[PDB]
From a paper:
The [name]-1 type [name] secretion system is an important determinant of virulence in pathogenic mycobacteria, including [name]. This complicated molecular machine secretes folded proteins through the mycobacterial cell envelope to subvert the host immune response. All [name] gene clusters contain at least three or four [name] conserved components (Ecc), named EccB, EccC, and EccD, with EccE being present in all [name] systems with the exception of [name]-4. In this study we report the molecular structures of the periplasmic domain of [name] and the cytoplasmic domain of [name] from the [name]-1 cluster.
EccD1mt ([name]) is a 54 kDa protein containing an ~110 amino acid (aa) N-terminal ubiquitin-like domain followed by a 30 aa linker and 11 closely spaced transmembrane helices at its C-terminus. We grew crystals of the predicted cytoplasmic domain of [name] from [name] (cyto-EccD1mt) which diffracted to 1.88 Å. We subsequently solved the 1.88 Å cyto-EccD1mt structure by molecular replacement using the EccD1mt segment of the MBP fusion protein. In both structures EccD1mt residues 20–109 adopt an identical ubiquitin-like fold characterized by a β grasp motif and an anti-parallel β sheet with strands in the order 2,1,5,3,4. Interestingly, the asymmetric unit of both crystal forms contains two [name] molecules and in both crystal forms the two [name] molecules are arranged as a head-to-tail homodimer stabilized by an extensive interface. The interface is formed by interlocking side chains from β strands 1 and 2 and the N-terminal α-helix of both [name] molecules and ~650 Å2 of each [name] molecule (13 % of the total surface) is buried in the interface as calculated with the PISA webserver. The interaction is stabilized by 4 hydrogen bonds and a cluster of buried hydrophobic residues including Met1, Val54, and Val58 resulting in a solvation energy of −13.9 kcal/mol and a Complex Significance Score of 1.0 calculated by the PISA server. Dimerization of cyto-EccD1mt creates a wide open-ended groove bordered on two sides by the α1/β3 loops. Notably, the dimerization interface brings acidic residues (Glu45, Asp49, Asp50, Glu57, Glu60, and Asp61) from both chains into this groove. The negatively charged groove of the [name] dimer indicates that it should associate with a positively charged partner(s).
Residue numbers in the entry:
A (entry chain A), B (entry chain B): 20 to 109
Write the structure that this text describes.
Amino acid sequence: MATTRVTILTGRRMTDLVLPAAVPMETYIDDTVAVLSEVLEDTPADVLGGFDFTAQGVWAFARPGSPPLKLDQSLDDAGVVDGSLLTLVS
Amino acid sequence: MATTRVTILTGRRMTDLVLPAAVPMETYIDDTVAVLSEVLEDTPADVLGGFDFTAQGVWAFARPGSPPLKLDQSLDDAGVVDGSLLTLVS
């Protein structure tokens, strides 16, 4: 399985992940959010810039400050390269 | 976020995955199965040894031939190390 290294920015915190490169983002985004919520459960809120893992609505990846990537596309389709910064948006 | 590379056995096929080592298995197993479903979607049926992605219960990881690991535990809790062989069972 091809993979890509991405770093998720949550406020000031960076978290490095290894994600499937060629599978649509919709296939794994929900459990990604769930994992990151556990990983950052003890992190102070001011450091997370108030980030809410319990936000309602449809989660997607986005390059910081940009419109969200299409969930039916893979990271490869979206041109995401190793070490790219992404955010989680809903 | 700690990770451990595991080898998932499906029939005669072995597929390496980098999984979160420190969060409960139940946090990511469902999307792991979904991802693996896409990755192995062109694998010939005889290589798959009757492995079925259609669940007969709640999915769990298991060391081949052993009782399934508890979903509330992490890979670390289960003593899983790099290149540990695991299967998916329901």
